Design a binder for this molecule. Structure first.
Ligand SMILES: Nc1ncnc2c1ncn2[C@@H]1O[C@H](COP(=O)(O)OP(=O)(O)O)[C@@H](O)[C@H]1O
Lengths: 43, 62, 67
């Protein structure tokens, strides 16, 4: 299986990637405001 | 000389891996890290060459 | 004021309190006539706390610009 079936377009691979990144970013802003020793945010 | 195609990276990964459990404590995760990150070289070789990354890794390390 | 905590039941006779500022010496503010109301010091601190509490609970500010 040297030749295989070549996956042509890459935008798929690098869209998902950067989406999870743009999302973990939000799930990160929150980590400070979890549980009893969590902290409040002023918007 | 050493032998490429990942082999060299693999032996190191395996050797650091086995001594990770013998390190223990805080470094136990760092050693595990170092070796696991090394495995990207063979995986991204297998990737570019058109084979399964886990497959080639788990066939090869074993 | 540290002379009222080591002051005995009968020995009160050590208890006194206050401050004067025109002459600049410690005076008996009940005899001097310096008097603030009861609530004026309770609802004074009660509020003062729920202020800094709210501010101390602040760890991230997010400011969003006008419409
Ligand atoms: N006394 C406690 N000690 C440790 N963890 C707690 C205690 N009370 C609640 N928790 C945990 O903290 C979490 C509550 O987080 P909180 O900041 O209130 O937001 P949310 O409840 O929406 O996740 C819960 O998952 C709960 O298991």
């Amino acid at each position: 299986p040297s030749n295989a079936t070549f996956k042509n377009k890459e935008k798929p691979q690098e869209v998902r990637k950067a989406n999870i990144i743009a999302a973990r970013s939000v799930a990160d802003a929150i980590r400070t405001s979890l549980g009893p020793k969590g902290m409040d945010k002023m918007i | 000389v050493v032998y490429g195609g990942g082999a060299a990276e693999v032996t190191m990964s395996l050797a650091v891996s086995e001594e990770a459990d013998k390190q223990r404590g805080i470094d136990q995760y760092a050693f595990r890290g170092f070796a696991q990150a090394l495995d990207t070289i063979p995986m991204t070789l297998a990737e570019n060459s058109g084979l399964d990354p886990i497959g080639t890794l788990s066939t090869l390390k074993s | 004021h540290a002379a009222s905590q080591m002051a005995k039941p009968e020995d009160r006779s050590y208890r006194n309190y206050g401050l004067d500022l025109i002459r600049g010496k410690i005076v008996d503010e009940i005899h001097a006539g310096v008097l603030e109301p009861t609530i004026s010091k309770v609802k004074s601190l009660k509020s003062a706390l729920e202020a800094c509490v709210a501010i101390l609970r602040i760890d991230t500010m997010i400011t969003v610009d006008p419409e």
